Design a protein around this ligand. Structure first.
Ligand SMILES: *[C@@H]1O[C@H](CO)[C@@H](O[C@@H]2O[C@H](CO)[C@@H](O)[C@H](O)[C@H]2NC(C)=O)[C@H](O)[C@H]1NC(C)=O
Ligand SMILES: *[C@@H]1O[C@H](CO)[C@@H](O[C@@H]2O[C@H](CO)[C@@H](O)[C@H](O)[C@H]2NC(C)=O)[C@H](O)[C@H]1NC(C)=O
Ligand SMILES: *[C@@H]1O[C@H](CO)[C@@H](O)[C@H](O)[C@H]1NC(C)=O
Ligand SMILES: *[C@@H]1O[C@H](CO)[C@@H](O)[C@H](O)[C@H]1NC(C)=O
Lengths: 165, 165
């Protein structure tokens, strides 16, 4: 009738879904997460406090083995946009971050769900802008002709290699 | 009886509505969003950190194809004032923003709904004040007789041209 097909799609795929648990139907394999980074700006290289302020564009892709639907049933449709609140998100952490509030370093709004099949899951694309307060060591021996290398360690804080890769 | 007609109006249009999904009943056309901007103040042109602090008035108009009602049924009322939490809002993002917390750069409080018909949708007006921390490059070659141009890039972070225009 007047109800959109995406309403039925989201009601169907997010029916028995539990966002508080890792969507790993298969037992013997971790969830592969593909993190991609773009540098947009270097806001501040703060020598006195060993912190660098970066403005990055982070893209995060994995496969959610529970949010899979058949495109033929739901009117040919192969994509749907949901909210980051409604699905399980990997806890990608910047290990050397100097900011503990994730509302000042991340702008998670929406996720994109592309189906691979009913029982095969769906690709989840997570695009969000970040502001990283990075703890980097400065070797100011050749100041002001110095070059500095800044490391960004990314990983899951609570999930090990057997759960999230 | 003693119940207002706007109570019956908001209960009827917001009955099967889902605010987590784009209100696009029609298939082959994006949602047109009309962003209008007013400059109210230039708080700070911070040369050392390449950021300009603006105080703007943003007005956002689109058509919500699901929130349409027949005025004649609901005592011939053509408008209703709702909250931004209750309806779907486009993710209008300032691309070069230096602030990721949207509670320090935006004051979304209410929305205005004007009906175009039962099955034709409703015009949504979103008025809110903003404080923009803008990443702008300064060419201080003619200081202090210098003129600077500051760019403000606006768009959806996750929705492409086929969804939001
Ligand atoms: C996650 O990554 C692993 C790689 O460690 C993938 O395992 C591969 O699976 C294919 C079959 O689909 C095999 O042909 C490859 O040999 C496997 N790789 C290795 C290194 O053994 C896995 O498929 C990926 N996806 C998951 C687990 O959903
Ligand atoms: C959104 O904007 C598009 C313009 O791209 C509108 O499409 C127009 O539709 C009218 C009919 O209502 C046609 O007469 C015009 O020729 C169309 N424009 C173009 C450029 O083809 C569309 O109606 C707008 N509103 C929506 C999609 O709800
Ligand atoms: C898309 O779906 C419609 C109806 O569901 C169908 O008519 C059309 O053939 C589909 N497209 C393809 C390429 O199969
Ligand atoms: C608006 O509705 C009221 C009550 O239903 C009616 O008395 C009035 O005539 C209507 N106005 C117009 C212009 O039809």
């Amino acid at each position: 009738p007047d109800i959109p097909i995406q309403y039925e799609l989201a009601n169907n795929i997010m029916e028995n879904y539990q966002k508080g648990l890792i969507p790993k139907v298969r037992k013997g394999s971790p969830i592969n997460v593909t993190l991609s980074l773009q540098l947009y700006q270097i806001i501040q290289v703060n020598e006195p406090q060993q912190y660098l302020l970066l403005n990055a564009w982070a893209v995060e892709r994995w496969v959610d083995q529970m949010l899979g639907w058949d495109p033929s049933e739901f009117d040919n449709e192969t994509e749907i946009m949901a909210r980051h609140d409604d699905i399980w998100l990997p806890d990608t952490t910047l290990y050397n971050s100097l900011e503990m509030d994730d509302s000042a370093s991340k702008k998670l709004t929406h996720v994109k769900l592309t189906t691979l099949g009913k029982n095969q899951g769906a690709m989840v694309e997570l695009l969000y802008p970040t502001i990283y307060k990075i703890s980097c060591l400065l070797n100011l021996k050749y100041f002001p002709f110095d070059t500095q290398t800044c490391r960004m360690t990314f990983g899951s804080w609570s999930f090990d290699n057997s759960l999230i890769d």
